[PDB]
Amino acid sequence: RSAVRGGGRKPWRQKGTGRARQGSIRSPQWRGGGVVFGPTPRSYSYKLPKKVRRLAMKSVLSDKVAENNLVAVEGLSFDAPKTKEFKQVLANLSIDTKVLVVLENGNDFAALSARNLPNVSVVTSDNVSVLDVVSANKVLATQTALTQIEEVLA
Amino acid sequence: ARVKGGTVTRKRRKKVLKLAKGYYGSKHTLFKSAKEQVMNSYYYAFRDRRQKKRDFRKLWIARINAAARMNGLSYSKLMHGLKLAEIDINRKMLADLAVNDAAAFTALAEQAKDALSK
RNA sequence: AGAAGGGAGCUUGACUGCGAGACCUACAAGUCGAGCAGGGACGAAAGUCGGGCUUAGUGAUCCGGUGGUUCCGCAUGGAAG
RNA sequence: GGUAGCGAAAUUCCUUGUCGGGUAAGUUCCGACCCGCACGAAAGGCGUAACGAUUUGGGCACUGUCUCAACGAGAGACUCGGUGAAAUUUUAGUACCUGUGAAGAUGCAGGUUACCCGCGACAGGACGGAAAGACCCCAUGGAGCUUUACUGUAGUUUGAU
RNA sequence: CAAGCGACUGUUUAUCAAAAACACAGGUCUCUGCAAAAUCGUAAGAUGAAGUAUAGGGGCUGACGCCUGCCCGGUGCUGGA
RNA sequence: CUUCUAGUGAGAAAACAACUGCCCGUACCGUAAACCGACACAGGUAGUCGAGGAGAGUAUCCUAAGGUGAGCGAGCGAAC
RNA sequence: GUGUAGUGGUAGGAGAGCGUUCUAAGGGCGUUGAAGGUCGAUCGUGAGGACGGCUGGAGCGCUUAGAAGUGAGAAUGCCGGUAUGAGUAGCGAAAGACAGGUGAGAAUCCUGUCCACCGUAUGACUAAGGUUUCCUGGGGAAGGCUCGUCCGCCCAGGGUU
RNA sequence: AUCCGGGAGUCAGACUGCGAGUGAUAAGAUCCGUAGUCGAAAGGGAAACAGCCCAGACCACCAGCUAAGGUCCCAAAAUAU
RNA sequence: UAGCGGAGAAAUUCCAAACGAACUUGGAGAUAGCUGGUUCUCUCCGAAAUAGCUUUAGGGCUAGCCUCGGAAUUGAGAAU
RNA sequence: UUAAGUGAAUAAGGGCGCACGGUGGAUGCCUUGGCACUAGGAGCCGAUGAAGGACGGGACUAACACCGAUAUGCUUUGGGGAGCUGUAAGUAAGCUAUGAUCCAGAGAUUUCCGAAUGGGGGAACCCAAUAUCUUUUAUAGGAUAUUACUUUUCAGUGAAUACAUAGCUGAUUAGAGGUAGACGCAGAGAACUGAAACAUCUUAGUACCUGCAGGAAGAGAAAGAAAAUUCGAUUCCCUGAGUAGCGGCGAGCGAAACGGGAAGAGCCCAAACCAACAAGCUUGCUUGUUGGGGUUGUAGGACUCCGAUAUGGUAGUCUGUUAGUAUAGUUGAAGGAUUUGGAAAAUUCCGCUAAAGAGGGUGAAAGCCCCGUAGACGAAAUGCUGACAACACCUAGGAGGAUCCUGAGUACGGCGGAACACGAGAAAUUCCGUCGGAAUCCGCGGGGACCAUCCCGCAAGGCUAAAUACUCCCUAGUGACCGAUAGUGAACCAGUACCGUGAGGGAAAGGUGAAAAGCACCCCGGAAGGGGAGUGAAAUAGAUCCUGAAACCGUGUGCCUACAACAAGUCAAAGCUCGUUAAUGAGUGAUGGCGUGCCUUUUGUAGAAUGAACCGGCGAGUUACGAUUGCAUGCGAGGUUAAGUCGAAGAGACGGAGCCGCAGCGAAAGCGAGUCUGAAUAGGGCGAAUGAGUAUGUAGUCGUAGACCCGAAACCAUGUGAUCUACC
Secondary structure (H helix, E strand, C coil), X not given: CCCCCCCCCCCCCCCCCCCCCCCCCCCCCCCCCCCCXXXXXXXXXXXXXXXXXXXXXXXXXXXXXXXXXXXXXXXXCCCCCCHHHHHHHHHHHCCCCCEEEECCCCCHHHCCXXXXXXXXXXXXXXXXXXXXXXXXXXXXXXXXXHHHHHHHCC | CCCCCCCCHHHHHHHHHHCCCCCCCCXXXXXXXXXXXXHHHHHHHHHHHCXXXXXXXXXXXXXXXXXXXXXXXXXXXXXXXXXXXXXXXXXXXXXXXXXXXXXXXXXXXXXHHHHCCC
8 A cells, every 4th residue: 555656645525425435546445556465575495403304315215215216327428428328328227217317426428418308307416305306216326426325314 | 376256256146047037027137136036035945845734734624624524524523533443544545535536435434433423 | 144344453465486277259358267386474273365345447569768687789898779 | 888870771580560652452662660680980871963775663655465366478397300417226016094013114914995008287105315413422532712720931031150 | 753773984704694893083091212112033134214202012992072989908010128 | 318527539510322220029819609717608807999869978768880690499378 | 784862043162175376296188179158957965066059269177285366245345337217307598581592411501682689889909818719622420508511620721021 | 060271252131920129019111139031043822023822943755643722704623512 | 925824994704616724745554442344165062241340331351151172080060 | 589697819018938139348368568586787977068858850740769950860990791761551762792771899960948157037038248250332240269156376456554454357276966766974853653541751863854975885903892711903694682771660662791603904193303494593592394203001112222224015006918708799400291270380100319308489289490599619999807017105123211202171070961771860981062170101091879909901193995785777587476457657659648826646548360361343322331242261350350248228939917905936736838968847827825125233123223226347364573372293301503604596414602491499698309488307388209392394372563454533744825815
C-alpha cells in the first residue's frame, strides 16, 4: 500500500453520497491496489550438525557399492581430448545408463571428453557431493581417486 | 507462485445448475438463487422421505375400512379378531386383497368373525 | 452464677526464637494451634500466663526518616553510598 | 437598606387579577387601580415632532378569500409519427376477515370472495424512496469557548553581575 | 384613528431571519509632553504623522427635552512610606 | 515645451529639386450558438451612437433605417 | 469372523482427506488433434473423478517428494458488461402558409409572395476574452435534444499589407 | 475421580413447577435459591406457536408395537359397552 | 493584505459553489475496548452467560465449565 | 322427437425442455515490457555558457526519433563487401565494386531561452554603447568583437583634512546554477501514537527545512585501555547480552572493556637556538622577514664534546620505456530417404560429429538448415591499470647534564543548559553561554563524588590510503519471480488524454494467417451492408479480425395452461411425446399431501431488525528475529559452532572466541551434598539420595514489528491561493 504510486487524498466525503467509506484510491480491494502479505526476498538455506553430513556421504557410497555399481578403472589417459574414445571406453566397460565420473586432479584430458550426451557428467575428487552421487546409477572412478576420497573422508 | 483462478469455480457452479433443471422462473439461471432452491429442495426431500412411509398406512387403512365394513366388521374388530385368531397378514397385502380378491378377503373376514365370537 | 461477674495481695507473659497440622480462599491476604528451646511471673503444690467474654478500632508497593549491624565497597587503605 | 419617575409592562407565576370603553358577544387592544413572585436612573429613567418593505388593535372603500360555485382562453396531460433518461430492485403465479407471532401480516392458521390480458384516474398499504437519527446515552472519542481548575510560557517589571 | 420599539438617511447572516440587531451625530471617564502612548515584526524598519493635548488611542451610552438618588465594608486602580 | 547664462565650440537660413523613414497588433464573434456558467443554458458582461407620432422624457402604445420567425410536430378540445 | 456397544449439536479442541500453480527425478501423450468451451440417462460416503459426441489448433498430463500470491455468495466491497422502471418523463419561453426549385430521399435546405416580432434595442462601432470558428469548393460516418441535400461539424485550397 | 502439561470460548441469558424479597401477595415486571427445556433440538400433541406435555435423526425399505393425545365429516381410528 | 493569519457599519460573516478555523503534498497502512467481512470437505468430543478484583460495568486477569497428551496408585468417582 | 345426466378439442398470450443465432469479452495458450538481484566499469556537469527546453531541417511533413543556418548531416582513422535514401505504405527523383548505406574511435559546425552576465522583461522577446568592416550620393539598413556583480593582487587617480584614508578608474584571480527522490557531516527541530487517562518519560534527535562536500565521507597516531603477568593508531563484523545500569524504579530505554576475525601505515609544525636583510639604527640590542635547526614520557630537544657524512625510503611526476585490458571484429565440425500433412524439425530405416548436446529462429517439436556456442586469431585511434627506468623529495650514532624550550584568558571553579545506556542523582568523563582565574619537569592529566600510596599517560597545533554504505547510469548474466483487473501509473507515440486559476490529482487501450496472397469480375442497394465467384489447409480466420463462457435479447418446436390465492418446491400421480454412458430409463404434467427465502447480530427471526439489482474478475492470520511445548532425527555426561578464508550466488572442508547441561543455599561476605535463619547438635524453608541433555527440521502458541482486512471526526511540518468575496 505505501509503495504503490498512489495518493492519500480520500476519494470523497465520509457521508452524503450514501456510498461506502474509502480511504485511498490505492488499497487492497480496488483494482490496481497493493497486495497484503505478498512474497518478499528471503534465504531458504540452512545447515545441519557436522556429523550427519559425514554419515550421509558414507551411507550413500556404501549403498552404491552394495549393488556392484562402483566400477574402478585403473587409469584413463588421452593425449588429445578426442570425444569419441570416451564413448568407446564405456562401450568396452559396458556402462550405458546414467553415470557419474570421478577424477583425481588436473588430468584434464580425461574431463575435456565429458561433454557427451548428458548420460555422463564429470567432477573432481574434491567436489563429490550427495546429489551428484544419488542422482546417478553407475559411477566410474580411477584407482587414485578412490584413495583420495578415502583421505578427505578421514 | 501466483495461483490464478482459472477454472476452479465454473466446474462447481455449473455442477449446481444442472441440479436445478426446470425451476419456475429465474431460479435456473441465477447462480445465487439456484443454490438456495437446491438447499430447500434437499430439506424437503429428506423430510418427505420419512412421510412416504406414513401415508401408505393411512391409505391401506381406509381401504380396509371400506371393504371390511361391508361385511359387518368394523375396521377395528376385524384387526382385533385377526390378531386373536393368530393371523398376521401385513396391511399392504390386506389392502391389495380387499381391492382384488374379494372371495379371499371374505374368507378371512369369516375366520375373524368366528374368532372373536368365542 | 463450677462463673468470663464483683472485691483483695504480689507482679509485667501487653516475652525472645519458633511451629506438627488444620480453616478460609482465584490471587495478595486473614484465623486457630498442641508442643520444643531460652529466660521468668504468681502459687505450698498441682499448675495457668505470647493481652482485655468472643466477633470491628484499619492501608500493597515506590520514596523519605531514626537505632543497630561478624554484610558490600570499581588499582589498594579509607570514606560517600 | 431603592429617592424622582414608571408599574399585570418586549418584564406578572397565581392570571382570562379588578373596574371602565370598544363588539349582538373581546383571555388581544386602549383607560384607570396597586398586594412590583422578580421595574429603576449612562449594561441610563421618563415625554417626544418627523421617519419605518417594523410589531399590534379598530374604522371607510373594495372585492370569488367566503355562503357556493359556474363558464370561457392558452400550455401540460390524452391519440398518431420521430428521438429517448432517472432514483429504486432477495426470487415472486403478489385478494379479504378474525386470530397467531419479536406483542399491528400480501406470504402462517381457519374460514369468505375471486374467468385471462389491458387502458385513464386517485394515493389507504407495501413499517413506501432519497439522507449508516440532527433528539437521548456511551466512547476513560474530538474540536471551539470561559474561569479565583492544574501545569507552563510570550510580554511588562525588579535586583546582582 | 390609537399603542409598543427604534430618533432619522444607511448596514447586516452570498444560499431558510433584514429587525426592536450594528453603525450613527451628541455625552462621559481614562490614557498620552513626542524616539508620545498603541499596534505589526526577534531586529533593522514601519503605521500613529510629515500630526503635537481644541491632538491621538481605549472603554461604556446612543438625536432632542427634564434629569441622572444612597453605599468605598468586598474586588481592581492610583498614591503612601 | 519657452527662455537665460556657464559654455565645447569654419558658416548656418533659405530657396527649390529629388530621396529615407525600424519592430508588434489588424480575419471573425463580441447583451452571444464563437466570452464566464460541464450544454447550441429563460443567468452575468465595462464604453460610444441610439430615429417618428403624441408626449416633461431614453416612460408607455404603434412604427423608420435594420434584424428576426428560435432547431420536434400533426390531431382531439375529458379529469386534474 | 462373530458378538457387545455408540454415532443431534453453536463458540471451540483433535484427526484424516479433495482440489489449483510451480520445482525435482522416473515414466508418458500430442496435426492420425493438447490445453480451453458445450452436451450427455456414468462412478465414490464427501470435497470430487473418468468415458464418449461437436467446436478448437499447440502444448499437457500420471507417480513420489517439496514450496505456496491455493479454494469466495454477501464488506451500503472495487472494475467492466447488461437488465427493471419503459417505449414512460422530457424534446430548454416568442406565428407562420402556399408555389417552384434542388435532390435516392424533404414541414426542417434555396428562391418567391403575403403575413408577423423587436426597435434606448433582438440595430451600428469598439475594450477585454476566445484562438482560424472568416471565405471559396466538396461530403453526410459521429455532434445538431427529431429531420436534414444544411451547419460555428468533416475534407481541400486561401485570406489578416 | 485426582496430578502434570499444550489450546480455547465464555462474564447481555429466557420462560416455565416450586419458596421468598421490592411492587398494590398487579405486569410477558424486577432481584435471588432450586429442577427442566430453549440457547446448541430437529420428530408427535396443544388449530397456527423456542421456553408447555411426549420423545433425542449414522443410512435405506410402499414391513410390525406403543407414549402424549384421540376415535361423526374436513382427517386414521368406537356413531363402542 | 495569508491560515498560530487576514478582512469584518459585528452575523461565527467572508477568504475560488462546502470555514467554531482554507486547500494540496508528507509523518501515515496515524489511533479506534466500536461496526462490517473472512473462501474446500468428512470423522470424534463438545461448553458458557458464574465468584472475585478493576477511574470497572457491552472491556480484562485468575478461578470454575470444554478439549488433547502423559504418570500413578486405585479402589479414591456415582446411586442406592 | 322430448327429458335427465355426462362431456372431449381449439391459445389473444404465458410456462418447461430442446435446437440455432446476436450482443460481451471470461477463460486456454502467447510475448514486443517489468520486478529482485549477482560480477565488473563508472561515480559528477558547469562563464570555452551547463541540466532542461522553444523554434526549425526532408519531394511530399501531422507526430516520434536524429540533426542544427555546414540542420534526415561535414572531415579523418580502422572494421565490412552488396544493396541503399528512419519510423511507414507510394510515387518522383537518384546513390553504389573508383567500396554506398551501416558499425567503432578521434575531430569540425552547434539558432534562441535558461546562474544568464550590456540594459529591460509577462522565459524561448524588445532596446542599447564603443571600435572595426560593409550597402546607397547620403540619411536610415547589415555583420564582427567587447561592455554585469562580488574578492584577490597590482597601478593610477584621489580627498571633509596636510600628510593619507575612504571613493573612483583600469588591469588581473576565483565564485555564482544543476542532481542520483541513494549513501555522509552539521545548524535548527514537531504531533497523532504507548503509558489502556496525562504533565517528567516515550514516539525521537526520527519526519520536514537549510548549509557543506566526496566517490566515498566521518575517526585516526594515546593526558588510552588496564590492574598482573600486561597491550600500544582508526574503522567494521561475531560474542559479551537483553548482562551491569537507568527509569512517575512505571510503560520502556540499554552499553563498554577482555576474546575471535577483515585490512593494515604513519607523518608534518609552534617554541627554545643559528645566520642575512630591514626598521627603532638607545649606536642596549628590540622589532620584523626570510632561510637553517626540532618534534617527545624509558621524558625529549636545545646546549657542549667527539665520530660519519653514510645507510635506508616514499602516500610525488601527469616523464619516458615497455606488458595487459575496455571501446568495431575474424574463423569456427557433422544427413539422406520413407508415412501423415499445406507445410516436417514428427514417425520408420540407415549414417555422422562433438574441447561445439547453452540458447534463439525457420510453413508443427532439429546435436548434423540459419544465427550461434567450445575453441583459435585480431586495433590505425583513444582510455585505463601494472612493471622499471629518469627526475623529485625524506631520513644518521655515541657521551655530559650548569642554563634555556616543551601549544594562556588555555586547564579548572561557580552559575544555567545540553552530550555520554546514566532523567542531579553520592555523579566521574565530554560540550555550549556567562562570570572568576592555575603551575612549568622538585611539573602536569587520569584510574566514576573526595583524600593518601601506587600505576598509566603528556592536552589547549595540523595531515593521513584499506578493510565499511549507496546505485540515476553502461556491459554481461541469473530467478521452485508477473504474464495484460497481474508486472512500473505507463508492453501501444503516458506523466499523455482529462480535471483544478494554482501547488496538485491521472486513466482505458497487446493477439488475423506461415506469407496480404487484405476478396478481380457480376448482382441488389444513393451509401452503408449484403449474395455469388475467387485467395486460401481453415473466411463461423474479412480487418470490431486466435479460442469465444455468464447476465441480457431473439426464431422454431415436443408437453401444459382462461373457476383460479402458488417462499414457487418435494412426495404421490393419469395421460401425451420419446429412446440413453442400457438401467428398477428421458421430457412434460392434469390432480392430491406437506411446507413462512439466504447472511449477520441476538434471550428470541419469516420478520414490519440488517446487506445483496444481475453475471464475470480481483479482494483477509503472512514473513524476519526471539521464547516455549509436542513429534522426529544424530551423538550422550556431553552437545555444539559463529564471524571469517578457498569454493559455481552451490557443499564443504577449515575456524573452539562463545552458549547450554553436569550443584546447590544465602541479599552478601561465604559454605558445599549441603546451606540459610537462629543462643542452639532444636525445629522449619530450600535442594541430594538413578532421575540427561544438546543441535537441527517440523508444527501449535506467544513477543517486537502496520501483524487478519476495510473504516473516521481530528493533530503536526513545508508549500499553493484575494481573477469570487471582505477592507484599502
